[PDB]
C-alpha cells in the first residue's frame, strides 16, 4: 500500500487536445510489487484518460493527459484505500507553434502581408512566430536564396529561388514557412553612373532585361519603399534608374527614369550621358 515511483514520459506538450503526456506510477509493499491495486489520478489542467487505474502484476499503472488550453498541469496520483497522495512532476502545455505567413512585415514600409512576388534584392522582411513558449530561434534551408537572423526572424532576400525558413521554440516545437521563388528579382547594379547603352549592355550581360516602363519600377517602390532603408543600400541617397526607351525616345535620343529612393519619375533624359543607374530585373 504505497506509491514509490511517479514518472512522466515528458514535460512539454502541445495544447492541441491530442499531444499526450504519460504518467507512470509504481505501487509497492516493501520489495513485493502490488497488483490490481487501484490508483486514482487528478490533474489541475487538462483531461486524464481515466481517473482510476489498476496496477499490472509489476505494480505499474499508466495514465495519460492532454489539454486544449496551455498552462501548467499539476497531476497527482493516490492509492484508492489510502488518504495521502503523491504529486507528479509539474508539466507544461503550449499552443501549436506557427510562422504567420500573413503577417510578414516589410522593414522599409512597415506594411504586413503575404511575401512580395517582386523582390528588391537585399530587401528585408520580418517573419512573425505565434505560439510555443515565446522564445524563438530561426533558420533558413539555404542562406544563399534567403537568409534569416537567428534570433529575430528578420529575413533578407538574396537569390531568385525557393527555400523554406523554419523556427523552433524552446518548448521544442517546430514551424516552417516556404519562400516561393519570386516572379522577378530587382537588382540595381550600384557600381557607377552609366548610360542607356552601357545599361542594356549591363542587364543583357550578367543576364536579364532592363526594366520595362516606369510602372514596373514604381511598383517595386510600392512594396519596399525607399530602397535605402535596407542595410545594403543604407548609403545611396539616390537610385535614379534607366527605364526602357519607347519608340520615340529612341529617335529623341532620350529615356525615362524612376528612382528607387526618391521615386522622382523623370523624362527626356540624355540617353548618352552617364545619367542613371543599371538596375536589372529577373
Amino acid at each position: 500500500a504505497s506509491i514509490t515511483e511517479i514518472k512522466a514520459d515528458k514535460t512539454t506538450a502541445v495544447a492541441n487536445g491530442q499531444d499526450a503526456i504519460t504518467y507512470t506510477v509504481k505501487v509497492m509493499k516493501g520489495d513485493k510489487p502490488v497488483s490490481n491495486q487501484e490508483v486514482t489520478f487528478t490533474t489541475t489542467l487538462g483531461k486524464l484518460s481515466n481517473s482510476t487505474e489498476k496496477t499490472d502484476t509489476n505494480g505499474y499503472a499508466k495514465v495519460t493527459l492532454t489539454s486544449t488550453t496551455p498552462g501548467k498541469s499539476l497531476v497527482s496520483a493516490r492509492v484508492s484505500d489510502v488518504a495521502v497522495d503523491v504529486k507528479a512532476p509539474e508539466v507544461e502545455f503550449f499552443t501549436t507553434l506557427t510562422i504567420d505567413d500573413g503577417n510578414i512585415e516589410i522593414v522599409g514600409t512597415g506594411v504586413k502581408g503575404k511575401l512580395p512576388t517582386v523582390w528588391l534584392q537585399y530587401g528585408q522582411v520580418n517573419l512573425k512566430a505565434s505560439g510555443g513558449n515565446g522564445k524563438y530561434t530561426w533558420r533558413s534551408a539555404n542562406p544563399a536564396i534567403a537568409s534569416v537572423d537567428a534570433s529575430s526572424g528578420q529575413v533578407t532576400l538574396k537569390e531568385k529561388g525557393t527555400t523554406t525558413i523554419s523556427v523552433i521554440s524552446s518548448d521544442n516545437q517546430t514551424a516552417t514557412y516556404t519562400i516561393a521563388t519570386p516572379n522577378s528579382l530587382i537588382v540595381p547594379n550600384m557600381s557607377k553612373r552609366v548610360t542607356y547603352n552601357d545599361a542594356v549592355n549591363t542587364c543583357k550581360n550578367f543576364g536579364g532585361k532592363l526594366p520595362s516602363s516606369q510602372n514596373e519600377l514604381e511598383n517595386v517602390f510600392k512594396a519596399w519603399g525607399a530602397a535605402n532603408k535596407y542595410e545594403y543600400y543604407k548609403s545611396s541617397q539616390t537610385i535614379i534608374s534607366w527605364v526602357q526607351q519607347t519608340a520615340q525616345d529612341a529617335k529623341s535620343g532620350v529615356a525615362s527614369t524612376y528612382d528607387l529612393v526618391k521615386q522622382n519619375p523623370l523624362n527626356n533624359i540624355k540617353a548618352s550621358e552617364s545619367n542613371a543607374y543599371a538596375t536589372c530585373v529577373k
Binding site: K251, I269, K270, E273
Partner: protein
C-alpha cells in the same frame, strides 16, 4: 557665289533653333549627382536632325539661285 549656301541655311537653323527652346518638350535633361534633373542646352536628336535638314535645304535654294 557660295556664301548663300550658308547664309540662307545658317539664318534658318538658328531661327528654328531659337524657337525650339521656347518649348521644354524638345529639350534634353541631365542628372546632377543628387540624382535630380537639370537643364542641358542640347535639344532632342530628332529635333536637331529636323532643323539641320530644313536648313541645308534652305541653304540649297541659296546656291541654286546664285
Amino acid at each position: 557665289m557660295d556664301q548663300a549656301a550658308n547664309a540662307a541655311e545658317s539664318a534658318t537653323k538658328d531661327q528654328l533653333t531659337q524657337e525650339a527652346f521656347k518649348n521644354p518638350e524638345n529639350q534634353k535633361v541631365n542628372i546632377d549627382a543628387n540624382g535630380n534633373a537639370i537643364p542641358s542646352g542640347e535639344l532632342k536628336d530628332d529635333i536637331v536632325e529636323q532643323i539641320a535638314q530644313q536648313a541645308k535645304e534652305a541653304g540649297e535654294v541659296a546656291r541654286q539661285q546664285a
